Amino acid sequence: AXXXXXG
Amino acid sequence: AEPGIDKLFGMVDSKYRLTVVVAKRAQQLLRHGFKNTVLEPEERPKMQTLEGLFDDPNAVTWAMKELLTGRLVFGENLVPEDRLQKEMERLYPV
Amino acid sequence: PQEKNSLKDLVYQAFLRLGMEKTARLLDALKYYGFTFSTTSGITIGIDDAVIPEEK
Amino acid sequence: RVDYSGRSVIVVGPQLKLHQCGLPKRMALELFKPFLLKKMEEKGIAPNVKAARRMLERQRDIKDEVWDALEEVIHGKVVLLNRAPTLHRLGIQAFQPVLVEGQSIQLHPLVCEAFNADFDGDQMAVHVPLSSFAQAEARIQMLSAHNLLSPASGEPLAKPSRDIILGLYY
Amino acid sequence: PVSLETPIGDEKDSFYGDFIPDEHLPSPVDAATQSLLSEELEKALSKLSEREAMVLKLRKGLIDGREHTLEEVGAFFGVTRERIRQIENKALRKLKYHESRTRKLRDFLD
Amino acid sequence: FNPLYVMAQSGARGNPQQIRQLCGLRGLMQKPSGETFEVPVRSSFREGLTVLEYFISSHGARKGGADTALRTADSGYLTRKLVDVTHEIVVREADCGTTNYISVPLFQPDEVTRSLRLRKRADIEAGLYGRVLAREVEVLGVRLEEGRYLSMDDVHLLIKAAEAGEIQEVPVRSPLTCQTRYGVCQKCYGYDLSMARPVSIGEAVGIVAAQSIGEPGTQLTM
Amino acid sequence: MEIKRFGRIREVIPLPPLTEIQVESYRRALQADVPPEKRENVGIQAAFRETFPIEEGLVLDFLEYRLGEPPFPQDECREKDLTYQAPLYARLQLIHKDTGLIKEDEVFLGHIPLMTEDGSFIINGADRVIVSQIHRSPGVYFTPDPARPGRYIASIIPLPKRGPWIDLEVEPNGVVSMKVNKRKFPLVLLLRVLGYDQETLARELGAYGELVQGLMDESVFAMRPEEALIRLFTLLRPGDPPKRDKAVAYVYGLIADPRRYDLGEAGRYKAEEKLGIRLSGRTLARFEDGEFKDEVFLPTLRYLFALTAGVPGHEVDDIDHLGNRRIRTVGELMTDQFRVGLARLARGVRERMLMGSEDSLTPAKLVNSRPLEAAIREFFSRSQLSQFKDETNPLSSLRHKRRISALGPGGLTRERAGFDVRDVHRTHYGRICPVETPEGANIGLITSLAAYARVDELGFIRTPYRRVVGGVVTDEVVYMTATEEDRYTIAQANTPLEGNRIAAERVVARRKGEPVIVSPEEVEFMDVSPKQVFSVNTNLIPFLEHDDANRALMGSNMQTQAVPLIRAQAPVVMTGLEERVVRDSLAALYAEEDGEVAKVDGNRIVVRYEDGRLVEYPLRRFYRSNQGTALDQRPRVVVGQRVRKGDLLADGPASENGFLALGQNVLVAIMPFDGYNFEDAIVISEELLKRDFYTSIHIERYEIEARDTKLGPERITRDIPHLSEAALRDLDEEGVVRIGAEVKPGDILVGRTSFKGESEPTPEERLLRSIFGEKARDVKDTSLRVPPGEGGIVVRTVRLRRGDPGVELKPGVREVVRVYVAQKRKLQVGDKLANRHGNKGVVAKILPVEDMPHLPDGTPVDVILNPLGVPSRMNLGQILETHLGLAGYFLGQRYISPIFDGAKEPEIKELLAQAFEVYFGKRKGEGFGVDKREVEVLRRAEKLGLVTPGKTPEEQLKELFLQGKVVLYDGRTGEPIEGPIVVGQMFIMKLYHMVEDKMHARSTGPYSLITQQPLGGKAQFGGQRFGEMEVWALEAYGAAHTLQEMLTLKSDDIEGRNAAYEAIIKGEDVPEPSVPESFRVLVKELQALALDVQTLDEKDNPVDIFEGLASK
Amino acid sequence: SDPVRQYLHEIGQV
Amino acid sequence: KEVRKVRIALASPEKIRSWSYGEVEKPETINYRTLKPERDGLFDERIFGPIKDYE
Amino acid sequence: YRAQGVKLHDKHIEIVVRQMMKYVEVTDPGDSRLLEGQVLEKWDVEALNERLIAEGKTPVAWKPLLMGVTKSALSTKSWLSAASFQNTTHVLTEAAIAGKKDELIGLKENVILGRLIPAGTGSDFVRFTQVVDQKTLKAIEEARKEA
DNA sequence: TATAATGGGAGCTGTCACGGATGC
DNA sequence: GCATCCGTGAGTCGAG
Ligand SMILES: [Mg+2]
């Protein structure tokens, strides 16, 4: 979910 | 980078004028099937196929090269539009 | 030694003096040698490479 | 939204010259599909346009000469690569496409900094400029290798970083 | 009926109607196909004399839109309905030979 | 030739502080309030943080993530505001022939207020490089003419003459003074900084400005 | 395969049942197993009790309820797209008060969804999960007024939609205001209505600093309880007639009515503890003996004034403290919707009781169950907290069941959510994981329950602690709330112990979250484990203490995204929680009692227990999950095997011998490679593909309906107009592709024909028809074909026909066909890989084996990771993992390394030494000395200070090996890499973000209804969005024709796009664009707004863009 | 403000 | 001609009637059986135009 | 920006600040039709003042007005730009009442209409360029030499 | 086509971020 | 002049 892509 | 790009930018007061010139020339070549080209047969841009070297299909490539030869004239109001059209149609039919 | 700032100034100066064609060639070159050399140089990371100074 | 456009995951390709990029075969076929129909009728591969399109409909109906015809279609032309979010003009750049096996778009390493793209899963979209005018604008003003400085600061934008700097320093 | 602006997803960025294809208007492929059909049909109707080509263009409606009877094309050309139907037959047949030969119009039959 | 040291020095990867966390101490940590814990994380990452140390740091971490996520939005918004308020600006002529100009100061008042001191090189470069002199400027026996596009070297020289006390401020052509309607002229603008040559007539300056101010916005704190 | 475990921390209790937060909650709400008379008043029982009796004269009261058995088993519900649910009956009785007549009947209320064994639901065939919600606890709170420094606000908060928030404040004019429903009025009035007299308020509030005078109003006592009540009603209801019974009804309903106003048990308890009083019920006041009696208001005013004065023993509240925030679990949330639906049913009942034949009414005639069913169905389908279940792997499901959301109904809008709500509060310790949260817009608003944490009956999260008395650590474990925890000094779990006694003179402890160093005499409690601080996901990261929290967050998150692999392995380095995760998720199958295994098959296992009974366990095989990943169980036992209770029978997906397997153990080298690992990109060996590492199975479901039409019926058939036997080759007699057939893009899965929409054939078609002499067919080809970029092997077909047993479809539908298509996906270029430390990257290059860096003994590495991904990321765990991995490679062993009690460098060095002996002394026995290249590398290592100069080649190679580094040869040259390279085993996973699901391209395609712009999305064969910002980008390049093309020829200029395509296929340059259709749309929508938008030429004369069509 | 309340008042007038 | 400007102003009821091709009188959409436009409805063909081309 | 180590030319900042000082407020209408307090562009007020001085009339007394980007953007002349930004209804009513014309000066307008933006290859300065080889140029020169 | 029946219910609450207009 | 109410904004893809 959002940011550079964790989730 | 496109070959000779620095000289091309050198030939104009505005880089966009270069684009317009290159593009209009490319369309002239496509419309007349290249018969109007100012390139000599040895200067013709080539493309490697499986058979062997052939004419480069890319009219923009051609235009940039012609511009590079100095054989082209450009500027505002060189000639009325319809007169240019009709003369180019007379000299090289398509 | 060549680092970030110096390489940046080289690319600027190269743009200025030799144009974008040559600067493009130069960039691709720098790319090639930089990568190829980085490979063989032997740069790695192991836990012991974080060297805690005694001073601490 | 727009026609003649695709998207995939970006992958690093250092073998590419600055002005190039890796565009998957399937992507390029669907993107240049009309040009490829025309080039197919320009050779012996198909009787006409509709025959060629019906020929390309199924995947098992696709042979070997068609990829060479496609190679001939895309010669000299450039695509647009774009990575969202598009924060300044260098978020879109023009590359000559080079057909590659697989399903991933291969991006040149130097331009990464200007796209703010890495390779931790990022994607990019491809746009095929159509007219001769469009193509001319793209190749002159929008080509990656023509844009080497920041329109913001003046300083270089495509410039060595990471592994490159490391190798030269070493 | 259900709302076209029925939200899809937990964001405001989607509407149900955004997924609904417009079947009515013709796609570029379809229109191109119709253009090439009309041009190939004109290419095959030029292999007939202007009379038989015109009778085939009046009996099928590529002229004023509608299809005329044998009495109207026979009264227009100034011939018998048997005669107008006869040149219609020979036009159709010459067209059948042209098609069996060149095979240009086969691909349009879907 | 230690890898961290190398990657740090070359500018390939890492800064002093990160490295410091890898080797030295992690450092002071912040409470959710914005207050700082009197107790510092004494461990490095190579050593291994305690449970409690890790938990203490988590506060800062969450705060920074939230800062990122909540920043992207407002940065975008600013970009769009800028694009809308400048969109009609394009380079329309070669010269508006304005006799007006601005004076870029090479010296700024010290905070001690003791005297005036030179400004930083980067800053003066930001206000000078690629600009056109609206008056004649002669220093160190070199003649910088009215109409001249200051190359980077021209700038450096101007700083050198500034240190020599021959010049305190530089008269230059600026958009703040351009009188081209619905845009700016070529001279008033300056270098197309993307090509280090004068700007081409017809380049959408406004958009480019909005984007140039926009892009690094996602890097400014909240 | 020896498994060596490290660490000295002895865990006193195991982890609780990990799905208990779901299962226990629902079981409690339903009380389905409790005999009716023994049910507690909680859950749906409480809902019934609040709803009934329904009065107005007739009266309908409630006796009991019952849940019957499910009409269909779970599997069958999954297949038929049915909800798994149980029938609900309520025993109701109708009394006519006057007649005394009593009619009693059991009425059917509809169905309620049942929770499966693993804690999830089946709603319309699809597995769903109800996410727990965090909110502000009901109760009485005191907070600082942001406007006025020395002033404070009192807030009385009930449960959500159980009544209004009431505020108490001391105004600048000194009068104390109450705010209800956004109405500010003097509290004095309400105090008068409550029965308070100036005397009682004077003696109660006297002691305070003249605040009480702001409560002094002569005009208010002058009106006694009745007039004050009517005065208040006029104040709260302008224009509504101030009738006496309306004022009483309104104020009662607003304040004293337990049916319209509810503090929770939690709100009631907390208010009690805070104001130091006792409550008779859950309302702010009562109606007793005709009048209103106080409960809350006076104590609250008393406290507020005391806090304002500065009187000691009065604090403001931290509203983010986990003592003031509680959890609504499945049970509570469902019960809330049930209560709403019941209330609607009651409005219905009273409706029908006014109307009727008043002499004959059964409970059946009165009860319409429809609104209740609607509220339940709505909750389970369209609620924000009801989420499509993540079954990607078993950890996904478990984590999903353990989620906590601050969003949803009555929850935070993300817009209202700033930093304070999203922070890690000190009270999160041991309760809600500090690591595991999304990076995007949801950060801190969606979280995960800590591993040892349990939600209590009040809804507060509690974490275990060990009691410590006089420096002695008991095996007594007490679970505390944060409020409770705040009273103690609590030692860290890693504090040294000899026996049960604290062995250090200085022990690290917490007091209200603050770190403090204390003597063992002062230690009251002690942590159970480092494990208790973190989520299940985070507890799976080994060497966590060496990873920056931000990268740990990512490893946490990405484990959720791991794809089950056909060859999946458990990690070489484990944290020790890998088995419990498999067990609690009900992934694997386990033995019930001791016994001997009778039969073993791919399809089933049969066990004979000590009872003598045969039990048969069917195995789920190649089932498709919600996310399309393959879920199948494989038998791990053989015939005749003796098994004890709880022994493994079958491994589920992502399980290797009962251990969680999210990926592969691969041999990695950490070095740059030729730019192919630049910026997080990853290089891999073809050997991985060759041995089917990172191969995963995926199943897609395609569906098609044949329905009845006004133009005639659609039909599934093999007879499809104008198709060759070639295209029909794999279709069966009925028109459905055969099991086992390979399908490729363009292929037909299900043949379908539809009667054509009435056709005006264009003259071209009439003539062409005459020319070919073939009748235009009645129907057309509507068949379902494989979409672009998809395909595989057909493993199943389902066919449901109307007029067939057990089958009833939705109206108009003649039949439904489903085709399932399975694919084996080998790792390819563009697929995303990651480790547990947050290191993630896309595979950029697949090298032939000979091209790979190799060990001197000839063994090639699997994976090349760039060291530049390390320094800036500060996640060193991956490094340690790799080192221990190295050891494990040569010793043939695996490790358990518990978080913050791990393997430490020295032990890893010993192990590495052992492995060196295996890696080298073998070579020494085989007859080979040190290689020349090794010598060169050793020379460079000596320059690097990596090895001590003067030792033999063997001693030096051992020194490097102990630093975890090895000599590596470049496969392309045969020359060594100039430095020694770190090499070892690492656990790496393939994530669900796969380039195969992503690549998409369009020439032309479908357009939208109103806009005539291309559709979005891969399934719709959409085009890419070129947004406002892309436009700005094109403008800034001054590329005007490319831009104009985007805005016209390539989108909504209809004539333009058609003409462009025609021109390109003809080899002609593209023509000049014209007006885009959406500008035309703009014009028409402005006209409908009664605005005249006119396109003018420079002469200011109108220009028609509609080409006359809109002008009469 | 609220049209229901308003009409109810206008009715409560006769 | 070339579009060089765009004007925006108030629409007089007479302008609105001039634009109009007919007054919709009935709050009816399409017939519940023939699925064709009702007479004087929101989707009438008599006002807004034919559903099929040239038919 | 300096603080965060961002090199950014003053130029762009000056372009925006330029758009901020775009407007002025009249303090005395003089011999004009304007009104005390009425706000208008500095350009237009300077053209009016030059036309009024050229007529020997009293010029307009005006005051420099600073306004932030959002207001200045909505305060544009072109209502097609103002509408597609913010407060759409407000913009559109104001304009429809004023019977406003959009001259399509900006980029936004032309983008909406789908025209060729007045920028880059679309600049009136360069788009009217023609190109011809020397052969055709000489043939046409002979045609012009004939008549 | 006819006992007589004569004023409604649901709110829903942790964000600014100000912007102008309106009020003692 | 200075408190206070109401209405309009709150980033980008991709998949739902
Ligand atoms: Mg990325």
Ligand SMILES: [Zn+2]
């Ligand atoms: Zn100027």
